[PDB]
Design a protein around this ligand. Sequence first.
Ligand SMILES: Nc1ncnc2c1ncn2[C@@H]1O[C@H](CSCC[C@H](N)C(=O)O)[C@@H](O)[C@H]1O
Length: 225
Amino acid sequence: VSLNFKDPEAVRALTCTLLREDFGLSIDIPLERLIPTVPLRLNYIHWVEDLIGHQDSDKSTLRRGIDIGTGASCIYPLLGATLNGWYFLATEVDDMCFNYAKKNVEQNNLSDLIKVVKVPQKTLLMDALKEESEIIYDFCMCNPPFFGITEIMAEGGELEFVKRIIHDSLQLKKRLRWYSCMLGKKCSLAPLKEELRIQGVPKVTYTEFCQGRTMRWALAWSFYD
Ligand SMILES: Nc1ncnc2c1ncn2[C@@H]1O[C@H](CSCC[C@H](N)C(=O)O)[C@@H](O)[C@H]1O
């Protein structure tokens, strides 16, 4: 395995070795798809913890969340379910990621806590949660996809993705307690904040995740007063 951390073979080896050593999670992921890095994925898991609230022992419940675009790694549910005993609905549109995510759930014996679903690509939350009338989800989380010489247009597409989540949230309302998404540039934040302000979303928060050279923002919102 390469010693140079610019090489994806080295990043993948480090991520997979970290997950085994610290958590006892063994994952298999293809170099064809985004290789998650663990420290940033953990920051977000902990931020979800802060958002959904600490429970006294007498009102402990199974926490339930939705990870939109779960990846080949199925990283956020594996971590959420392993650290915290959270249940996840985890969605994917990509066949290769779906196959891999399922395999990673099974191989870490977590099929009881994580349900991986392949949705259709024009769908987001509303189709996955349609005629759910029995429980309220505590959260959704999302690390969004980036959809000539200038696909930094790809990076800009994160805005339209989040707006779709905002769109679904406006109909689902209190069916989930906290909607959230990680953002790739701090200049995605101001327009999204203004979009929630003008739709009258009552509760909005945000935070920073820093891993050395790399900086991410996450935004979250709720229709609960
Ligand atoms: N409408 C949609 N519903 C569910 N997943 C989607 C989607 N649109 C794109 N995706 C998936 O979202 C993923 C974003 S990349 C994030 C992967 C993983 N959560 C991680 O943090 O490493 C991709 O695998 C892409 O296939």
